[PDB]
């Protein structure tokens, strides 16, 4: 499928990542910039996040999913519903707004597109009505993260796809921190793309740190596949 090569053609080996933040989470201004590689035939990226504006004002692990869907294992079988890779190198938008139970909101705005042979990711993040006492700008969740899978359906109204999911943060105590997710990707670029059937992405994430790192900073490890049309 000539169509479907152009993409995958540009994820067939180890390719470089840029991530940049600009934040501001109820008045807490915040940057982060993060770097490493991904390796889409194996669905692994390997990623480092430092905050340059001093302490990140939130837990590293609420910005997970806002901190590369275009990584994902395709099976073969699967070729034809990948929208993120048939969108490159000019790339797409995703945009989400995320609900924290009994808490504040992310609004988000990002491009994923490349610039020569680094893939990027530029992001801007507003959050609003949080509790400065909560569990977000209290610092209250655990450095972890569990697995989840992510559901992608077609969203032909605006040529593209849209994703629902919840993640679970868990606390200090048993407790979790739910952060329901709406998401939505668009085409940058005006020529075709492919409109998937639903399907989902199986997501594993660790957290790790750098000894030698004495900036406020998040090492990332993560694998995804995608399935669910047998």
Known sequence: ???????????TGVVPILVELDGDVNGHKFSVSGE????????????????????????????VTTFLMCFARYPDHMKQHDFF??????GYVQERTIFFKDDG????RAEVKFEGDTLVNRIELK?????????????????NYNS???????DKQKNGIKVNFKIRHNIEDGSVQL????QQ?????????????NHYLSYQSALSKDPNEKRDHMVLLEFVTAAGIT
């Open 105 to 108: 909101n992310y609004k988000t």
């Open 127 to 143: 959050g609003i009505d949080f509790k400065e006492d909560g569990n977000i700008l209290g610092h209250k969740l655990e450095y």
């Open 179 to 182: 952060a329901d997710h709406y």
């Open 85 to 90: 890779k048939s969108a490159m190198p000019e």
């Open 36 to 63: 490493g590689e991904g390796d889409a035939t194996y669905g692994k990226l390997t990623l480092k996040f430092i905050c340059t504006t001093g302490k990140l004002p939130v837990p590293w692990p609420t910005l």
């Open 185 to 197: 990707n668009t085409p940058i670029g005006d020529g075709p793309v492919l409109l998937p059937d």
């Open 148 to 154: 989840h899978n992510v559901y992608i359906m077609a």
């Open 1 to 11: 499928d000539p169509m479907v090569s152009k993409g995958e053609e540009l994820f």
